[PDB]
Amino acid sequence: QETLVRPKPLLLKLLKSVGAQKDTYTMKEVLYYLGQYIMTKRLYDEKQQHIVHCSNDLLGDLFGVPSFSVKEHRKIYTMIYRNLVVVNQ
Numbered sequence: 877q878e879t880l881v882r883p884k885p886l887l888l889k890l891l892k893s894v895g896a897q898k899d900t901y902t903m904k905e906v907l908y909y910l911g912q913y914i915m916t917k918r919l920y921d922e923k924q925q926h927i928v929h930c931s932n933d934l935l936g937d938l939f940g941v942p943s944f945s946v947k948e949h950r951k952i953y954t955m956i957y958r959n960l961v962v963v964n965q
């Protein structure tokens with residue numbers, strides 16, 4: 877989670893929409909802003925808080941799915957990797 881990364885133009889436009897201001901991040905900080913995007917947009921369900929629904933949301937489009945579990949860390953990593961580039965420092 878200390879690997880430095882640059883999100884692609886669309887994810888950047890997603891994180892900067894919830895208060896982000898860097899162009900270079902770590903996985904930690906990216907997950908935090910995705911968290912706030914999820915708060916901000918009420919994507920987190922109250923009936924069961926294991927599923928984020930994003931089918932009508934730009935996140936669904938970046939992620940390629942209508943919904944995912946917040947416990948499916950391996951699939952979230954994957955979906956997010958496909959949306960960034962790694963940098964030196």
Ligand SMILES: C[C@@H](Nc1nc(C(=O)O)nc2nc(-c3ccc4sccc4c3)n(Cc3ccc(Cl)cc3)c12)C1CC1
Nearest residue numbers: 907908910911914915920945946947948949950952953
């Ligand atoms: C560490 C993993 N993050 C998490 N893990 C576990 C767990 O393992 O229990 N529960 C989690 N609950 C949340 C969460 C998310 C949004 C909201 S909004 C109100 C409460 C709340 C709680 N997150 C954060 C999260 C952030 C971004 C994304 Cl995209 C997906 C999940 C959890 C990470 C994927 C690798």
